[PDB]
Amino acid sequence: ESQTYEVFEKDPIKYSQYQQAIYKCLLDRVPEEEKDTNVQVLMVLGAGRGPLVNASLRAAKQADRRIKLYAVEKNPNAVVTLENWQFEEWGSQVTVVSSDMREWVAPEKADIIVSELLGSFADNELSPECLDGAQHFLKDDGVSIPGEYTSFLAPISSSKLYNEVRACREKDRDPEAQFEMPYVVRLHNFHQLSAPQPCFTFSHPNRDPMIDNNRYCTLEFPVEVNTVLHGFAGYFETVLYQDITLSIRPETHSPGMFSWFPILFPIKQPITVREGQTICVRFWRCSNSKKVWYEWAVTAPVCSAIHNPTGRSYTIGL
Amino acid sequence: RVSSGRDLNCVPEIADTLGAVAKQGFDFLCMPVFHPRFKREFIQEPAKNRPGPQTRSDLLLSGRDWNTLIVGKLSPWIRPDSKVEKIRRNSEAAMLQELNFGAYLGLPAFLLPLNQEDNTNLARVLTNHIHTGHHSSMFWMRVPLVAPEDLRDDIIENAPTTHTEEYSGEEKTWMWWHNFRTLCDYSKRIAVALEIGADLPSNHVIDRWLGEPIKAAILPTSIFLTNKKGFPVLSKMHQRLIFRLLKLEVQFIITGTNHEFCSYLQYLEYLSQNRPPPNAYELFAKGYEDYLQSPLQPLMDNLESQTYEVFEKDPIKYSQYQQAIYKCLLDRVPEEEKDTNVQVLMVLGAGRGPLVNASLRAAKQADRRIKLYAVEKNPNAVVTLENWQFEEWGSQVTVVSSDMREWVAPEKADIIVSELLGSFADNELSPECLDGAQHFLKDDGVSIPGEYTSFLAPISSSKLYNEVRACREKDRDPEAQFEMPYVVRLHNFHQLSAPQPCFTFSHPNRDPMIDNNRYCTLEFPVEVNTVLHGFAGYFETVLYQDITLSIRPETHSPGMFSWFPILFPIKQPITVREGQTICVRFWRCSNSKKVWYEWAVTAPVCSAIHNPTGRSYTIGL
Amino acid sequence: RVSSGRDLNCVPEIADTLGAVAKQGFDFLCMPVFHPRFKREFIQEPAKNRPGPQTRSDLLLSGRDWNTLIVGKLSPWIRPDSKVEKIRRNSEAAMLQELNFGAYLGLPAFLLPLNQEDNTNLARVLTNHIHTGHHSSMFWMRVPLVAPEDLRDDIIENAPTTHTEEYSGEEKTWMWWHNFRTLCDYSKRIAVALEIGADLPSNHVIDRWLGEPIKAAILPTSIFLTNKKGFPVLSKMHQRLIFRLLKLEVQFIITGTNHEFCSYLQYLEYLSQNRPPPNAYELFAKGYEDYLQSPLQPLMDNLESQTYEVFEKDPIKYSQYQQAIYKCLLDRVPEEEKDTNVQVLMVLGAGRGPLVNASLRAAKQADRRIKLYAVEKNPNAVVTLENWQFEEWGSQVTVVSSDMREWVAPEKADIIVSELLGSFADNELSPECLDGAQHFLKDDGVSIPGEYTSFLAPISSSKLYNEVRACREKDRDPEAQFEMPYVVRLHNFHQLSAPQPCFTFSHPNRDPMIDNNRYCTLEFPVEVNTVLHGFAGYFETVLYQDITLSIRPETHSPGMFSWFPILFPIKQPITVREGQTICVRFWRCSNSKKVWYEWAVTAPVCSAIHNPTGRSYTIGL
Amino acid sequence: MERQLEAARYRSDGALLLGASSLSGRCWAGSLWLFKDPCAAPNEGFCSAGVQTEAGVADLTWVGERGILVASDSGAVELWELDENETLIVSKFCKYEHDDIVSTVSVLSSGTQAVSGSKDICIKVWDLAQQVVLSSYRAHAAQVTCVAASPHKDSVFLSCSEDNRILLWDTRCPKPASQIPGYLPTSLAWHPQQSEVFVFGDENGTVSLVDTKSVLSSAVHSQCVTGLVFSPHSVPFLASLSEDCSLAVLDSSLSELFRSQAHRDFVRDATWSPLNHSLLTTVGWDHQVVHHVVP
Numbered sequence A: 001e002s003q004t005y006e007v008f009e010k011d012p013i014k015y016s017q018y019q020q021a022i023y024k025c026l027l028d029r030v031p032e033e034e035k036d037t038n039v040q041v042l043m044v045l046g047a048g049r050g051p052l053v054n055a056s057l058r059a060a061k062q063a064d065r066r067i068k069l070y071a072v073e074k075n076p077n078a079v080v081t082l083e084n085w086q087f088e089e090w091g092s093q094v095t096v097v098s099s100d101m102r103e104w105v106a107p108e109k110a111d112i113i114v115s116e117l118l119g120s121f122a123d124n125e126l127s128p129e130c131l132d133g134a135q136h137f138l139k140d141d142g143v144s145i146p147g148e149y150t151s152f153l154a155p156i157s158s159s160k161l162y163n164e165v166r167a168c169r170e171k172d173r174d175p176e177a178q179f180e181m182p183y184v185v186r187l188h189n190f191h192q193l194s195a196p197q198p199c200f201t202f203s204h205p206n207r208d209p210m211i212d213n214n215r216y217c218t219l220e221f222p223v224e225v226n227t228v229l230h231g232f233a234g235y236f237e238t239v240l241y242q243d244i245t246l247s248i249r250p251e252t253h254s255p256g257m258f259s260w261f262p263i264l265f266p267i268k269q270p271i272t273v274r275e276g277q278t279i280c281v282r283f284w285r286c287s288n289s290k291k292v293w294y295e296w297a298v299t300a301p302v303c304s305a306i307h308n309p310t311g312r313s314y315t316i317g318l
Numbered sequence B, C: 001r002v003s004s005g006r007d008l009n010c011v012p013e014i015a016d017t018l019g020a021v022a023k024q025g026f027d028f029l030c031m032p033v034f035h036p037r038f039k040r041e042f043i044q045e046p047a048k049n050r051p052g053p054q055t056r057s058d059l060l061l062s063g064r065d066w067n068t069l070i071v072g073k074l075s076p077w078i079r080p081d082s083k084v085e086k087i088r089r090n091s092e093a094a095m096l097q098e099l100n101f102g103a104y105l106g107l108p109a110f111l112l113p114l115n116q117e118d119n120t121n122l123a124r125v126l127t128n129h130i131h132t133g134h135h136s137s138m139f140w141m142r143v144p145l146v147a148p149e150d151l152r153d154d155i156i157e158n159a160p161t162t163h164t165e166e167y168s169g170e171e172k173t174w175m176w177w178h179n180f181r182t183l184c185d186y187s188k189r190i191a192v193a194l195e196i197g198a199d200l201p202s203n204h205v206i207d208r209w210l211g212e213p214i215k216a217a218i219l220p221t222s223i224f225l226t227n228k229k230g231f232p233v234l235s236k237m238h239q240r241l242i243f244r245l246l247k248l249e250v251q252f253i254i255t256g257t258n259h260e261f262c263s264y265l266q267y268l269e270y271l272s273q274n275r276p277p278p279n280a281y282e283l284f285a286k287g288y289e290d291y292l293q294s295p296l297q298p299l300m301d302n303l304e305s306q307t308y309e310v311f312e313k314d315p316i317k318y319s320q321y322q323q324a325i326y327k328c329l330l331d332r333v334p335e336e337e338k339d340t341n342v343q344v345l346m347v348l349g350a351g352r353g354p355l356v357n358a359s360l361r362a363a364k365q366a367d368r369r370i371k372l373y374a375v376e377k378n379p380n381a382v383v384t385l386e387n388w389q390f391e392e393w394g395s396q397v398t399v400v401s402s403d404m405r406e407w408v409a410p411e412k413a414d415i416i417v418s419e420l421l422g423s424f425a426d427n428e429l430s431p432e433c434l435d436g437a438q439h440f441l442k443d444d445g446v447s448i449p450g451e452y453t454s455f456l457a458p459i460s461s462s463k464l465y466n467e468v469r470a471c472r473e474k475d476r477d478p479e480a481q482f483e484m485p486y487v488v489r490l491h492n493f494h495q496l497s498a499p500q501p502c503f504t505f506s507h508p509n510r511d512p513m514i515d516n517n518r519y520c521t522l523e524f525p526v527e528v529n530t531v532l533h534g535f536a537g538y539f540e541t542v543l544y545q546d547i548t549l550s551i552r553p554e555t556h557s558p559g560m561f562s563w564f565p566i567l568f569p570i571k572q573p574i575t576v577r578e579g580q581t582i583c584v585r586f587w588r589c590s591n592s593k594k595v596w597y598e599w600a601v602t603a604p605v606c607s608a609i610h611n612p613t614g615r616s617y618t619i620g621l
Numbered sequence D: 001m002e003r004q005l006e007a008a009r010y011r012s013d014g015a016l017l018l019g020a021s022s023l024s025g026r027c028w029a030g031s032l033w034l035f036k037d038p039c040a041a042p043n044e045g046f047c048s049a050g051v052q053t054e055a056g057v058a059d060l061t062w063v064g065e066r067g068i069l070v071a072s073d074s075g076a077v078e079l080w081e082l083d084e085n086e087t088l089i090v091s092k093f094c095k096y097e098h099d100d101i102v103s104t105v106s107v108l109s110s111g112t113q114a115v116s117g118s119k120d121i122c123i124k125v126w127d128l129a130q131q132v133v134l135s136s137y138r139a140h141a142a143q144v145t146c147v148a149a150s151p152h153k154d155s156v157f158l159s160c161s162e163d164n165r166i167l168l169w170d171t172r173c174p175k176p177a178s179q180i181p182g183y184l185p186t187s188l189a190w191h192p193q194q195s196e197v198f199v200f201g202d203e204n205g206t207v208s209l210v211d212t213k214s215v216l217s218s219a220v221h222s223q224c225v226t227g228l229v230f231s232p233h234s235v236p237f238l239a240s241l242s243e244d245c246s247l248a249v250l251d252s253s254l255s256e257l258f259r260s261q262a263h264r265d266f267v268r269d270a271t272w273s274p275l276n277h278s279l280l281t282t283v284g285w286d287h288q289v290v291h292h293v294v295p
């Protein structure tokens, strides 16, 4: 909706970080002698209502380099905003494309592809599948901003959140589907039981003959306290360009960035954990041609059921 | 008849192999559905594009032969939990391919191994296949009694075998299974194929497997010794284990090379022939093994004609009631008063009349005079009583169509005879009914039964846990099935501690305040590692002095099949370690309209209180 | 074998009566469970306190005899809809008492009469008994084809019988039943016992009873005429009605006095012996009458081996495909080019190979040369194809393990042969698959099938309505069962109007925009009063020119049992009067991942739109 | 002949022994073939001798000049011997001692005894003349992948298994095996000159050089190292073959000299010609017999 994008646009840190990553990339790709003759093709993939298009233009005027911009957006309602801003302000410098990244046939290859397709668990909005589909129109030496992202998990104790998840039982569905799906939540009344550890990582552009976005990850969490495990908190880190990054990992959280709250993967049954015991968690990233989903299971100190087998309770539509 | 299959890894020609296997006397064949050495690539070229066919055709056997004679096997190279990513991914693809081929063929079962501790990814690929379609076919998890690392010869000089005792380590293989079936969420389609070795483990290791869904026992040819005659036989230790597996009606699988096969099968048939035959109880109970039933409520509901006929088939119950009445008449009327003293006997809940007849046989045995009243609230049973009273009993018996608690008696009773007991003694509301009929018993009068006591014992049964969970039904709480008792002939289970007394009631109740509410705490020492799934309930009753009835297994009245045990389940299974104490709390609760039980486990871990306020289960007054 | 029972109101001795009834050849006995004249008081004294027994004992027959040989009857004096309050209250108490006694005895069925228009209170007392326990026993509502007031002799001078035509009035007895079963909320336990009279009503009155749960037909002895020989027989008009009732497998009940009984039964056995025997279709369909099945989805799901074997049992389907291919080869290759022109044939969705074999038989019949490609996405079916290609076909056939829509062909096709049709033609997604395989058909190439059309027809079936409603399941919308099609061999129903064409697709699709979405309005004239419960769906396909396949009942291909009709149900039954038009709207909808149907009735009354957005039912792309 | 060629071994004179199985289709049997003209292989009409075996050939070796020892899918170890004219392969023994597929056979230095390994987890030492099992050893905890007899010490042999153990055996000791936590070991080869040196291949494509008294390692393949065969030269080369479908030839420091991607399916065995020491033959599941000119 319109008011969701307005909320995305209220974040000053996210865009100033994207501007800086673009600015650095233009200086490294075009030397001062080529400045006024070399026009870099920039493609904003999932342009929304235009804040990354504006950040790319501010980055080009900051870098003092020339750019040709394409704003690709599949949401037709957001395209109305883009096409009006293109007539009233941008002009011919920006060409608005009303399309899906993965279906669009580009008139020329890109030097840089700029996107902001990340969720609170990095790849949960399907940034890997979208960017793989837009890859072929990036020229062979081209850069993707972001170039990389990594998700993190940390076991948590929260009898309040356990009870809030359980409260989400609803008619006409599995009586425990609420425990088999992630929630975005500003986690408050909880206990982080162990330091967050990296779960899945994706790199762009993906240069590998076989491209498989499926993952399987085992994490061992030492707990130095007696407690009850109720779920796992999820966070992420992204490398936009070289040293320009974004993070919601609490230890390295980008200051003043409120675009993403953590995610919570719950467990159906609370698991007792004694001081000295290790919480072992298994996470899977699964997919088919139509859906992407996660499965998870606790294997130590006690086994849980595998949560969300076959995406029965939760999927992310392709 | 013992149902046996042949296990093979080598099948040159499927039709020739199946025939030889049938000629040897086997009922089925476990064989690979793809050649066990034919490893397949799914990602990398050029091997990925290997020309087919990938295996032999479904057309080589009939649909019925695939459906009834073939058990499929996972290829040995399939390792979904490999540490090499490439192996793990080809193994995931190959495992789905082989399982989908078994589904295509309509195989009744498929064998998968549990031969290491970490099978998380194997479980994840199986779970996903189980949630793809709607099939009934079984997955038999091939797990050894003893892990292969704990069975190896002590012949590695710089890596000796552990010589000390590891109580929990000798049962590591049960934890391999327990974890696999916990990740797969107790699927009804996942069962155990127990692989038995030459050297059996300690009794505690075998005991773990009690109450587990064992569907097959794999016997290697190497465990068979040769007798003087030349025929194959087993040690007394293995014969003992085979007899316990025959009670569970598992299928036997012969694996390994011949060291003439129908000979190994004739040995198993001889063992099956030579064992205690089914007794009167076990013949009645045939078919009811672990069948969950709702306990009868004779007060709230009117029993059908065929329920009373089943009650009447029990010869022990009535001969015990006759004897209790006989003893009571002799003690109440001395030989000098014999022909002048007429004792007023009231059968309270007479049904179709078997206790009325037992009272008359007791009076003629005792040689005493009695005036009988047959009180029965079920009007349909009163039709039987009133016809029997006209045709046979006459004026000696007066039939009363009434509720015990509402009836206004013409005279006080000397003796009140009732059979209002359930499998947990007081669960059919014998205390409330007899309290209401008490006022018309004369001050020195006797109640038969005079007393009854219920007992509980913790149990482990992954089969029954799963059968209770299966009872989820629409338009009710999604966990109401775990908050109610079931009458069940308990079979595939492990009693974790001796039964202990729970609630006791005495009749007549001589106390100013009469409160039938109870609260009981029981502490059960467990001498084994296990998983608690519920509590078995039994009872004992004193009919009169030394005449008793019991379904408590240690004192079970011989040949009495009127009551099977009751099971109080728990929503969540509770892990219990050797040495830990299971602490259970039971409440008997009531109001003016309903009676119910609540229960909770408090040690080693707390459970929720089950059936708060009778929300899932009540017994109507 | 015709299953017959004797109906009696007079049973002096139950055992003597049942034996005479068995000796006459009857399978069961309908008799009173209380004496029909023994009227009972439940409120007023002194009659209220009448000494018992109230009826004969359950002990006079075995449990099995009560359970299998006895149909109970309500006492004739029981009138729950009496205008006298006292009669209505004793009748409510007596009706519950008699019904509870039948439940006690374990009777398989009980007879209740519908012999007047207002049975609201009878329905209320029956409904309450049905919601007391959990039983399977049946209530057979005894209703006449002709009301007794409309059957009386015209012998009352000051009250003559109506001589005019009352179309709706001649079918008043169906409304008596319709209302009773509507108040009882279509209970599965309430069925019809149709009482047939000497003078049958008009055909429309008999036709009302189409699609109603008739379980028994009551034939009075007075409707039987005597032939020259002296044996009992029926008029051609009654024989016709008996033959329609034999298709519904009802039980026959002989009532009234003998005017030697096994003679009336031998007549019925002779009629059952002398009628058209079951054809190839009716022998295959045996057991599947009104069995609701989910339609197969061969695109989204991989079919099992035994599903393809069942597809292959159809001799007509393939001989029709062979003939269509044969005709196409002769028309595409002239006799002079015969040995030089090799036509590229592509079987799209080859399964286990029966269309590949039909294409080879067609080429040898036509005496033309062909290059074959067998494309199949199911990998399990590809194992069959690749083995058949090695052992038999050779290089003439190249097997492709692929999806039609993804495959990159080495050369263009002359002919594309497919069998991707469902019972509603396009419900297995033949349009989307063939559109995706179109580009590799050469510009003048042919598709077999070239065309297919679906048809709908409104139906009345209270049995199927109730079978659909029974499909409610936990964890889903409580009415999703009414928002999805079922494959069903429709049996106990009434087709209310001729089938009309719904959607048509043509192959190859030569149109710049290819939209497989459809919207269709159909107007169905109904010439009868009735209740609409859903729409039957059928199809027709043009394979090539005059070679066709059809399951449309008016043009059904003889002996073809590959497709049963489909049923699109409606959540709420819709009343339709004679002369009214049923207006139905059908939509074929889709997105990039799913295809589905929506439907709505707009005349004579609106329904809800069924399956909005594919919420209850989709067909995976 | 069956599609899946499993073994290729040259004898002294230069005749090529081939072992094959049908790992798919209707019949899952195997066969042995002798080619006195190796360039004619795998053509059946231009072979010297050939026979069909009951089941598939998991592995084989030459026992002298006449004998052929076979590791069968049936659980049998079979000995076949050539005719006096070398135009017939005839069975001498078929002993069913393993309870699962016999995955590997190796003739001990004396030429009179053999070691077999299996999926039944056992290692059996055989007396080839008596046609009996001398000893049976359950040292591993999972299926045995490879057994390699010492070239010159008759009581010494290596074995490896899925339990992640490489065992050095000396049958003269009371506890005859000893262990030598990486990736699973999958192939073994003793050095032809250094009696205390051996190479091993792992499931991750790495080839490692080991000294039994006391290392060198290299990432040669992108999949399981199926086999390791030393050349007959003074300073030998090492032929490495994998499920990645390639063949590599390495020097004494495990650095790559040659590479062939000729095979379209898994490479199963490699054999160096005794006549031309730069000629290396390989077979695979693609039914190809390839002759490589190795620099």
Ligand SMILES: Nc1ncnc2c1ncn2[C@@H]1O[C@H](C[C@@H](N)CC[C@H](N)C(=O)O)[C@@H](O)[C@H]1O
Pocket: A005, A008, A009, A045, A046, A047, A048, A049, A050, A051, A052, A072, A073, A074, A075, A078, A099, A100, A101, A102, A116, A117, A118, A130
């Ligand atoms: N495959 C796709 N092709 C085109 N646009 C897409 C695709 N997937 C997602 N999007 C759009 O990408 C945007 C992702 C948003 N989370 C970010 C909005 C915007 N770039 C901002 O920073 O305000 C939305 O506007 C989506 O509709």
Ligand SMILES: Nc1ncnc2c1ncn2[C@@H]1O[C@H](C[C@@H](N)CC[C@H](N)C(=O)O)[C@@H](O)[C@H]1O
Pocket: B298, B299, B302, B303, B308, B311, B312, B348, B349, B350, B351, B352, B353, B354, B355, B375, B376, B377, B378, B381, B402, B403, B404, B405, B419, B420, B421, B433
């Ligand atoms: N309060 C009550 N007043 C009268 N009868 C009762 C009452 N509660 C239960 N009953 C009857 O007592 C009987 C209990 C049965 N379990 C035993 C039947 C019978 N005495 C026998 O041994 O075969 C049933 O026939 C009940 O209907």
Ligand SMILES: Nc1ncnc2c1ncn2[C@@H]1O[C@H](C[C@@H](N)CC[C@H](N)C(=O)O)[C@@H](O)[C@H]1O
Pocket: C298, C299, C302, C303, C308, C311, C312, C348, C349, C350, C351, C352, C353, C354, C355, C375, C376, C377, C378, C381, C402, C403, C404, C405, C419, C420, C421, C433
């Ligand atoms: N898009 C597709 N590409 C390839 N095969 C398909 C596709 N959709 C369906 N099929 C196959 O087409 C077949 C359709 C069947 N109803 C007919 C089977 C077979 N032709 C017969 O007449 O016995 C199945 O074997 C499907 O798996």
Ligand SMILES: *c1cnn(CC(=O)Nc2ccc(C)c(S(N)(=O)=O)c2)c(=O)c1Cl
Pocket: B227, B229, B231, B232, B233, B260, B261, B262, B263, B264, B266, B267, B270
């Ligand atoms: C196949 C089938 N049956 N027999 C008979 C057989 O094996 N009998 C048998 C089995 C076990 C034992 C212990 C004995 S006994 N009572 O003599 O000790 C006999 C076969 O011989 C074949 Cl080949």
Ligand SMILES: *c1cnn(CC(=O)Nc2ccc(C)c(S(N)(=O)=O)c2)c(=O)c1Cl
Pocket: C227, C229, C231, C232, C233, C260, C261, C262, C263, C264, C266, C267, C270
């Ligand atoms: C009892 C049973 N069976 N029969 C024979 C009988 O009634 N046969 C019979 C019935 C009907 C008809 C129309 C004819 S026919 N073909 O001769 O017209 C014969 C009995 O006689 C008794 Cl009593």
Ligand SMILES: [Cl-]
Pocket: A049, A050, A051, A054
């Ligand atoms: Cl903007």
Ligand SMILES: [Cl-]
Pocket: B186, B187, B188, B189
């Ligand atoms: Cl289940």
Ligand SMILES: [Cl-]
Pocket: B352, B353, B354, B357
């Ligand atoms: Cl009796």
Ligand SMILES: [Cl-]
Pocket: C186, C187, C188, C189
């Ligand atoms: Cl119902």
Ligand SMILES: [Cl-]
Pocket: C352, C353, C354, C357
């Ligand atoms: Cl076929």
